[PDB]
Ligand binder design. Structure first.
Ligand SMILES: O=P(O)(O)OC[C@H]1OC[C@H](O)[C@@H](O)[C@@H]1O
Ligand SMILES: O=P(O)(O)OC[C@H]1OC[C@H](O)[C@@H](O)[C@@H]1O
Lengths: 808, 808
């Protein structure tokens, strides 16, 4: 009974207000205060100094209540403005503050007034930021691998970690006051003549400062809700505000009672975590499961609320998550097209009750979905947990919201995740509780460390280019791991010798990436403790230490490998026309590539490369499994390493692979020279594990075939897959059953990680590229998340216009 | 064959030049550079940043060669000037820089020019110094115990640690280059994907920077030795300088060959360790044992050198140790009268060879002693290792140098130390290798952490005052550990109930002292790694971490308990006239003490206290063993604690007691109100474990009897004992045998820790108080060390005139 076409004047009023905020400003309050507190409390341990900085900023910053919201709590002085966090870096800010209103798709209105506040702070943080200090440690060799871009890790060096969901049931069952009580018994057991206890109490001291200021904050919003009602003349909203301060008074301290309370609270947390740290992908976890016992109480039974005012609340909320904005560098902005935050909300899945698995779909799962389908907004990121025994009813209701052309909902697959989690050591009832984090990755909400994916980026295409030409990276002229065999010298005797070169080179860029990651993570852990986040994850409080120090019950991280499709395609093409057939010569190719297929003779060569050799995504086994092998070397490397939290507390403490590379395929391509699959220099790579655009000619069931052949179980950082259909292709009920049997076959027979759809027509993308001004709420799906189309650059825009359009 | 009366014009020229440096200046170079490097390398790990600071300062500072020295290497731009080290503190410097040329016995000429350099640096170090940060951590309660002075620890909060001897045999066997080789193999085994190895390599990186700059420095003194010989016209010294650059060239790199080389090298180290850190009591250890194989080669056999030019070299050296100066606060200066450095040189003892103990006295032991006896200088601090089988010849030669009236040599006692070391876990052949450190304490040179004594000060007299009056400290009006029983309320039922109050109060000031020490030591270990010192102690290089982190093979520390005599005397007096006899009333006493024995009635009361009750030091068992018990509570407390290095590497990791309190008895007295032993308010306490001045009336054999009854074995921080005789009392050979049988009986029958003599007449102390100007090389012994008498304040001067003068 899905009524997906009807908003309300209240929420239509807001959503538009926001989508027209087309060049956001830069609220600078937090970088003002945090410098003060770092200047006033230089003598404190960093966990306490940071707890003060936050408690200061929290009660000296502008707060307001616009748009007649049903949910309240702003990230910044000005609407949709992006705070400034100087602890992680200043370097890209001391290069780029003039050049910021005109930045191809990451433009920030930087007021002459708030620019004054920036020249003032900045030069003091120089030398003492995470990024500055990473460079204080890096070995010289590490420093070159970074300059080139072969291994990239800007995102960890210029931002907090985040990439997790905190323990929202805890927060709800105890309320803040019950966490002070948790903290109090814990510092009751501290002994100050025991080294480890001496450090443990600084971190516990810090937690209490933060917990405190947060209660105070919730009350200084109960404050406004009444000081506003004073000078307010429209009765109907005063009766709302009075209930909100009435509802905020009760959530600043005790466990919440209603639905309106248990969802304002969880937002309050979800916010402060993004004011204390700029890490993106603060997820929500299984919200349809932990807000449900209030939805049931309130509106299903006692019916003191109406199932339609529940759906209106969430909306206000969804729009507050849209309010959350964040500014990134010029370089990293390219790989994060459309300033996203990836705040993920998870619905569905199973639920291990007393040892037996049980369908977890419930009436709030339908209410949450149906509220997303009506709103058509980038936020939240809606991720649905499929399982073999999901209803036909709910899956059809998922296909209904897909035909709404904003990319949601996306799918994750209990059929693959749960058995692999159990298989790593995760507690069986925790493996059933996994959520989506950020984009397509998966963790156990409330019990996992940071970055279940999101660690360092490796460029598979550039590395393979080096395995072909004597270890030489053509982009930068460097040779980091020398070797004799190169194409230009045509002295590979057989293809297996090319595959060896690959196994040899990647084994050395993986070591480096881990050495680099070891520095970053160690700098992040000495300088920037996330106080509140750590309070709200198990088992920090009991171990009295931050997540980065080993506070989390579980801890697994993944990197991101970019260039998947191009690696398969390249190897398979030099395998066929160079070795197998002799059609093309080693030097003839080497000269081809060092030339960017230039001339007319070299162009014929490229086209024989593109179409005279099997491409990944046509259910062709020869290329598909060649790719799985090439990747398998990388997965085999990660096994002889342990991440920095190994042995210091958590379970697991290891790595795995991951393809959730956001829009890094574009700027990563610009750094990759011509490649043997026929790709020209600088053009884009392929995003995620999707097929390279325009090479998949045997339709969608052949695509999922190819994708499902990758070693999914070792790639628990997510296997990203984009598909695009035309709106007329998915139109009748006969077309809907086609999508459904396609999904059910992906997840059950093939064991797929994820799939997300773009239901857009190719002319609509093209009128919005042209007339932005009548398309400023059009949502298209990028890769792991949704974006406002008019907001992406044109590089970003056309990668999305180039993708294959499939029939069902 | 001791010729103790003959210097040389060369060395007489120098010694006088120095003793007239009567208000020293403040060379500010090092605080200039170190701020630069902390400002240029803010991004480095602290171990590397500090290694740079040192390598910078080391090759940008004024260096010279005055006085026609046979040993070269200056601590500072100006002669006898005191560098400035801002890392440990600035606070006492931002209060006291105007008020510094007139400071009762710690006056520093602070040039208007070098005062300019101080206002410039200082305000940047604010908030980031050891002291500033300790206060960033201390619990509020900890902070009050500190304000009062009941527990004091200024010396650890405003200075490096030191209080050790580094591994001088190593340095000599390998030379610097062989330590680069040591360091190189060590970083060869580093793995940069292993957390502990990632930190290990920063510390190893740092060590190499320092090692390097030190070789460079030794060569930039080989530089001067020739650039001077150029513009030099007195042939005879050019032939010396040429050999010194000739000898410095060989010691900047390789293991030294001669005696002149092996003793210039060890000085070079002994110096740089006092430019990198301001910790005092950089000792030398068993120099008569590790320089001897060169003395033997050179002059005993091959005779290429003359036993009289060896004795002239050491002299130059002794005078370079006198050149070493250090500036301290206004408060801490009082407890360190006569700006000393306590650089200790140890001679004699035994020597466990292949499992059998053997006399270690040798011909360099006689040469070192005889060179001290001729020179009559505060530096070095000469400590002799007695054992039951020491010769009559060498002991008489020790008594000869005593009749020289400069306090040296002092005595330590293999008969007590070795069996207690073995008994703690120390390797048997290391227990035979123990040296003296600083004053009277004992450690295993090259294998021990910092502060075998020198940790936190406790005031036994003030604490006992609190056990008498309801936990009330009368000095400051505070009550830190409340209790009902007080004298003013006369409600002790029996004396055992007073002893309980004592056991209860001290058990609580000991906990606090350890909590305080835990903060200081942790701040010292996060902010101020001693690079070179750590390189030269086992087993830092192998564990790749500093001493403070657990680098040292062995690690035991002691505090200092001040007020020993007064505690015994007080308890024994309230035991006799209050309880036992009823002669005096509880309130009558309480009112007595709260009054500073004022009136004429209260004065009779005091005199019955002084002389109507047994005092410690008359071989009286009742008071002697009452004191040992009172102290025994404190020793029993230390057993349930472990110092911060417990479990992190070293052996032992524990505490023990100690009485080596330097001149803290005076300023500590000023903070202690009238006490039941008859002492008036503010007057001095008793220094060390000596008898309270003027209460020991049955002569020296009765004194050593009393002292020997203390629990010596648990007091391995040293039991300090001062004795003073008149020069005519120790004059004939019949008088010498009296001193010798007194010593041999102390150490063998009583098992004494230490004894040192003042052979001065009471009129000589009084003419030098009056006519300073004809007495500026008079040395008198303070407590653990020697001082120039005209340099001590008058408070200091008269504590020394008040001591008992004994007959033999
Ligand atoms: O380097 P960054 O921006 O921190 O990592 C980017 C990550 O953002 C979080 C997403 O869940 C993941 O798909 C993506 O890889
Ligand atoms: O607090 P400070 O000055 O570091 O300690 C003073 C110490 O100096 C080192 C001496 O060996 C010891 O006798 C004395 O107690």
């Amino acid at each position: 009974t899905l009524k997906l076409d009807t908003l309300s004047d209240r929420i239509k009023a807001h959503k538009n207000a926001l989508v027209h905020i087309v060049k956001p400003p830069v609220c600078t309050e937090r970088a003002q205060h945090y410098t003060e507190m770092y200047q006033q409390h230089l003598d404190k341990p960093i966990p306490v100094r940071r707890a003060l900085a936050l408690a200061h900023h929290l009660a000296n910053r502008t707060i307001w209540i616009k748009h007649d919201e049903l949910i309240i709590g702003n990230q910044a002085s000005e609407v949709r403005a992006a705070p400034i966090f100087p602890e992680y870096t200043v370097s890209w800010i001391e290069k780029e503050i003039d050049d910021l209103a005109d930045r191809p798709g990451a433009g920030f209105a930087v007021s002459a007034a708030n620019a004054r506040v920036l020249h003032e702070v900045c030069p003091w943080w120089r030398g003492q930021t995470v990024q500055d200090r990473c460079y204080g440690m890096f070995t010289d060799e590490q420093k070159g691998l970074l300059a080139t871009g072969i291994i990239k890790a800007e995102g960890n060096m210029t931002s907090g970690d985040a990439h997790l969901a905190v323990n929202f049931p805890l927060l709800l069952e105890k309320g803040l006051d019950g966490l002070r009580e948790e903290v109090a018994e814990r510092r009751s057991r501290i002994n100050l003549t025991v080294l480890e206890d001496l450090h443990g109490e600084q971190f516990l001291k810090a937690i209490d400062i933060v917990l405190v200021a947060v209660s105070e904050h919730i009350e200084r919003f109960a404050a406004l809700a009444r000081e506003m009602a004073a000078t307010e003349t429209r009765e109907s909203r005063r009766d709302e505000l009075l209930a909100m301060a009435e509802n905020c008074d009760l959530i600043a301290h005790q466990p919440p009672q209603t639905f309106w309370q248990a969802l304002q609270l969880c937002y309050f947390i979800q916010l402060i975590l993004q004011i204390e740290s700029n890490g993106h992908s603060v997820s929500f976890g299984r919200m349809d499961q932990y807000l449900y016992p209030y939805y049931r109480r309130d509106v299903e039974l006692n019916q003191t609320l109406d199932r339609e005012h529940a759906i209106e609340m969430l909306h206000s909320c969804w729009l507050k998550l849209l309010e959350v904005n964040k500014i990134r560098s010029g370089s990293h902005s390219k790989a994060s097209a459309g300033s996203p935050l990836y705040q993920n909300v998870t619905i569905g899945g199973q639920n291990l009750v007393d040892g037996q698995p049980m369908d977890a779909v419930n009436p709030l799962s339908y209410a949450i979905l149906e509220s997303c389908g009506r709103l058509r907004s980038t936020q939240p990121n809606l991720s649905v947990r499929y399982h073999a025994g999901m209803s036909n009813d709910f899956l059809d209701a998922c296909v209904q919201v897909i035909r709404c052309g904003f990319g949601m909902p996306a799918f994750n697959n209990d059929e693959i995740v749960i058995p692999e989690f159990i298989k790593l050591g995760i507690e069986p009832q925790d493996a059933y509780d996994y959520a989506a984090i950020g984009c397509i990755e998966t963790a156990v909400g409330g019990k996992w460390g940071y970055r279940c994916t999101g660690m360092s980026f490796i460029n598979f295409a550039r590395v393979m280019l080096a395995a072909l030409e004597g270890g030489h990276d053509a982009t930068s002229g460097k040779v980091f791991l020398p070797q004799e065999k190169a194409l230009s010298a045509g002295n590979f005797n057989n293809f297996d010798e090319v595959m060896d070169a690959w196994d040899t080179q990647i084994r050395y860029y993986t070591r480096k990436s881990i050495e680099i990651e070891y520095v970053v993570d160690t700098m992040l852990e000495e300088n920037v403790h996330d106080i509140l986040c750590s309070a709200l994850v198990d088992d920090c409080i009991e171990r009295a230490k931050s997540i980065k120090q080993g506070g989390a019950k579980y801890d697994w991280v993944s990197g991101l490998q970019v260039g998947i499709a191009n690696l398969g395609n390249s190897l398979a093409a030099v395998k066929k026309l160079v070795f197998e057939q002799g059609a093309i010569g080693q030097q003839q190719l080497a000269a081809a590539l060092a030339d960017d297929f230039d001339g007319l003779t070299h162009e014929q060569l490229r086209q024989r490369l593109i179409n005279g050799a099997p491409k990944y995504g046509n259910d062709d086994d020869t290329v598909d499994t060649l790719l799985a092998r090439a990747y398998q070397t990388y997965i085999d490397e990660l096994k002889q390493y342990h991440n920095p939290r190994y042995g210091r507390g958590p379970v697991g403490g290891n790595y795995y692979a991951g393809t959730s590379s956001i829009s890094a395929n574009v700027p990563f391509g610009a750094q990759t020279m011509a490649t043997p699959d026929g790709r020209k220099a600088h053009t884009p790579l392929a995003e995620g594990a999707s097929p390279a655009s325009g090479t998949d000619h045997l339709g969608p069931t052949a695509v999922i075939g190819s994708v499902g052949k990758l070693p999914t179980a070792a790639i628990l950082g997510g296997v990203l897959l984009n598909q695009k259909l035309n709106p007329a292709t998915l139109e009748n009920e006969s077309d809907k059953q086609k999508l459904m049997i396609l999904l059910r076959t992906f997840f059950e027979v093939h064991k797929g990680w994820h799939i997300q759809y773009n239901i857009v027509s190719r002319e609509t993308l093209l009128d919005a590229k042209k007339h932005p001004d009548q398309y400023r709420d059009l949502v298209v799906r990028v890769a792991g998340y949704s974006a406002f189309f008019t907001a992406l650059s044109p590089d970003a825009q056309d990668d999305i216009i180039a993708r294959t359009e499939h029939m069902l």
